[PDB]
Amino acid sequence: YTISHTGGTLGSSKVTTAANQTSPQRETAIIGFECPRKFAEIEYVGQRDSTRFIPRTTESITGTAGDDTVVSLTANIQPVAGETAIEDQDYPVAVAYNVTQGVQVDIDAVDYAADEVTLADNPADGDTVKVWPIMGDGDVQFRLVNQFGQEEGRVYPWATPLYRWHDFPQLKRGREINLHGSVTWEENETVEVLLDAPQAITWEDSDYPEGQYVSTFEQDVEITL
Amino acid sequence: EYTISHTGGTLGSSKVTTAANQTSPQRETAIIGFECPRKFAEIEYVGQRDSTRFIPRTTESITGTAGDDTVVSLTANIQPVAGETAIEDQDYPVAVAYNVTQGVQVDIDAVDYAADEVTLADNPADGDTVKVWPIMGDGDVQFRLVNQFGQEEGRVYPWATPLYRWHDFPQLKRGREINLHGSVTWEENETVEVLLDAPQAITWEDSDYPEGQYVSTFEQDVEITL
Amino acid sequence: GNIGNLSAEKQISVYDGQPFVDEQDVPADDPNTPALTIEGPDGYVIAVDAGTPIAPEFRDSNGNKLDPSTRVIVQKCDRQGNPLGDGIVFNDTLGRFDYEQMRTDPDFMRKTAKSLMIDEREIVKVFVDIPAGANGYDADKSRLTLGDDTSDFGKAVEIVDHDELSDAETRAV
Amino acid sequence: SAEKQISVYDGQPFVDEQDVPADDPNTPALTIEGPDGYVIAVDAGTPIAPEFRDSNGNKLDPSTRVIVQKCDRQGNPLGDGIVFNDTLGRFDYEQMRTDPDFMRKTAKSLMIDEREIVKVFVDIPAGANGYDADKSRLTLGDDTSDFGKAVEIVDHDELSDAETRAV
Amino acid sequence: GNIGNLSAEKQISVYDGQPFVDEQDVPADDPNTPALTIEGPDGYVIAVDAGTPIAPEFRDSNGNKLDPSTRVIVQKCDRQGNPLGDGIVFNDTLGRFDYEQMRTDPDFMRKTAKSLMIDEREIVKVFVDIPAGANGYDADKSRLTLGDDTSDFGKAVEIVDHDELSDAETRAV
Amino acid sequence: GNIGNLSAEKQISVYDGQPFVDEQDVPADDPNTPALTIEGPDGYVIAVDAGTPIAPEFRDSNGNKLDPSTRVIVQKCDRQGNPLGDGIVFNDTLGRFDYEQMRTDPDFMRKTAKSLMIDEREIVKVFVDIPAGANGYDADKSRLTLGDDTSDFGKAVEIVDHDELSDAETRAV
Structure with a gap:
């Protein structure tokens, strides 16, 4: 039973x-x-x-001038259900958080082959950001x-x-x-x-x-x- | 059915x-x-x-002054509890009292069931107020x-x-x-x-x-x- | 909203508040005074089997207990108010009582010695014989109770309305 | 026939809502009662639409557990007799109550008499901002599709009533 | 140099400081939080018959007794810990008891209205319905004694290992 | 602590990362270069039923998609790698697919035509025919998902070890 x-x-x-x-x-x-x-x-x-x-995994970076882009994150990123653009996906491929401001970031765009991403807010020099993408x-x-x-x-x-x-x-x-x-x-x-x-x-x-x-x-x- | x-x-x-x-x-x-x-x-x-x-258990109130050791007739024919009149042996208190201005409990020493009277150890203050909760x-x-x-x-x-x-x-x-x-x-x-x-x-x-x-x-x- | 049927027999006690009775304060040492006069309740009928308790909580005007040497009697009278000699149910003293437990333990509860039956108009009287010294009898600071109807002990009065052949044979007094 | 095919939601006068804290599962969020004169029947494969949200109207944590569970006539649950134990993270709220392909369904059938009780419990971790049903709600069963299913309601009929009384 | 060939039916009582029961302090007025939690000891079987007493020595964190209006309930649960609702053995208040002598005299022994049975996994809970202004429940100062194993009065609790046909019957739950 | 014994027919899907398959970056205009190369796993036997899907998620070095007029081909060969000519399963293009969903909905699940059966050394190869203008092949970013072993849809591939007369009748091609 x-x-x-x-x-x-x-x-x-x-x-x-x-x-x-x-x-x-x-x-x-x-x-x-x-x-x-x-x-x-x-x-x-x-x-x-x-x-x-x-x-979902972890990466971290430090800020300076021109850092509207985050690197190939040592992770073969994949679209979600085939879908790419964030707001339409079932769930976020990745999220990130500025620690000094202590706030969330919204994302502009992604490049999956080079495994890079493009944000909206250029963080401050000396500032710290955490990212949590998928694995x-x-x-x-x-x-x-x-x-x-x-x-x-x-x-x-x-x-x-x-x-x-x-x-x-x-x-x-x-x-x-x-x-x-x-x-x-x-x-x-x-x-x-x-x-x-x-x-x-x-x-x-x-x-x-x-x-x-x-x-x-x-x-x-x-x-x- | 259960x-x-x-x-x-x-x-x-x-x-x-x-x-x-x-x-x-x-x-x-x-x-x-x-x-x-x-x-x-x-x-x-x-x-x-x-x-x-x-x-x-009912409610009563009293006002303080010099000589206020004896709490007056409470307008209830008080009885012994289980035939007993000494408080500490009783299954439950015949009556309790509380100073409001101090905001504290007070105990009871002497009793009288025909007079409906009792007597305490805390001589209250002139201008003070006490409430009492005796049984019905x-x-x-x-x-x-x-x-x-x-x-x-x-x-x-x-x-x-x-x-x-x-x-x-x-x-x-x-x-x-x-x-x-x-x-x-x-x-x-x-x-x-x-x-x-x-x-x-x-x-x-x-x-x-x-x-x-x-x-x-x-x-x-x-x-x-x- | 069911309540459950009953017998016609109600198993209860009495006291002074039950308004078919009158009190009366007493002098020092008169035995003949009708302290308490119960009249028939003019519409109900009583049955007090023997073996029936009393708590005659008698006290003075200052609230102190009366003398234990006092004698107490409960007696029947006619419809006019005249005792019969017979029809006695109690003759004892307060020395055989203890006010603090005289309705608690059945070992303590003194009881009747005879039966009693009261019609619509008959009378019961309480008689109280006292020596000189005591300070009379104040009914204000005193009371009475008659019957035990609560615990798993005791035996109460059977109070009743009228049942037909029961009354037919009742009136063979 | 006297069988009525309907759905269920929070605003009906036989289902009580209740705001909840952030780390208590035993509390009843939603509590159905028998309507005192009718009888309800649910069958397996029945959908749910628990659009749960916070005091700011944002969604709760996906890791939240939702449980639906029958209780006795006292309000005391039963352990056995669960129909649902899964998470909010599986429900795309924008299209959960629309596409059958995303409709998440029940496992068992169920039967409610005039007094029986159904309750919904929610297990949240510490950090989240609780549960405010003034903005959130629930919807249960689908009347409108050949897909999906609905809920049966009746008054009392002798044979079926005496049979349903034999739980 | 013999001991006595014993029945499997060991007649004992329960105390809080045992390794099949857990205590848990309580807030003011959270009744659905359990005071105690008895679980089966993983291999034995217990039976509490009717007529079984309780000595729930509950006190506050400051040593005083709780509110006498507090309600206590004992009840069986499922293996999941959820209340069965049905299967209650007790529901009364603390003020019924006299901690001086609640376990002492049979004359104040309040007991269960039912028998009860417990498998290897079955669970009992002891819930406490309290008003607001109480000073909670400090199990570090409080305890419980269910049943008796010393008095010639009262009863005890039967405990056994698995006997074959009786266990096959006991599994009819 | 049981696991559940199993049939020999393991139902799985196939992809590049497995250790019996090899990838190779490719230029534009050779329809003969083996992009992918499967081999027998040295002792087991593989069976792809006819009615099996594919997801050849093929892209370039810059991550973009290839020309849809590209033709993908799949073909069985010998133990030395020489194709047999016959035993082809596939001949179609990429534009037929939709990488967003080509392994999700059965309305788009392009599938095989014939069955397939691999001994301990037989080989399958995958070929790509393109014009010159494309940005070649980059297997390091591209991949393949053959069959499904997770869904209520599609089918899987049967791996088996050696059962005697099964292999005896299987080798009779």
């Missing part, structure tokens, strides 16, 4: 762990979904249960961990590239992602979202303008009671 | 119950009204089986039904039970707690009411009270339909 819930950035319990990867290009644990006392068991079903992943490259998958901390086995031993999650309009029914495989938890067990990517990804930067969480990993699941 | 016990109270399962005061002429009036909610199906109270609890004495109470119009539809056991038994008996002990006579069945929006006739005006919700927000209380163990 079961119903449908979702695991989330917070999900059904304030024990879910959020850690970030390494700069040495080697796969790490992004997230640990640890099953709680409250529940009996958790089920995932690829090809039934949808999933959503808005990753580009990246290979993810699911891992199983017992109560002891031992790896049991990966799910569907075929990684998923990151950028499909950007390429598809994630909200449209049918277009949303359905990965492969199955997996089942027990009480004290854990499952782990693993990723390999070269750039560091973030969560929970205080200076974000739109929300207290920059990046989200939501997933649909079946639950027993 | 039925359980419950406790109708000053606040209870719905925040639409009314508590209001009586009048000074010897008139039977409405003290409390339990209006039934839509949450429930029906409610039942059964005298001789289910219990009821009541602590009524004489008075006769009963229950009333009222339909969804205000029309009376029935009393219960048409005999105004006296008040001072509630004070005389140690309300909490089994076999000595109070049970009235009669029975009753609520319905969705109808009201039941606790009615009383007595000289003195009762109170609740005097903000200057030390031991709580409500000076008096009415409780009734009853049964509920889900």
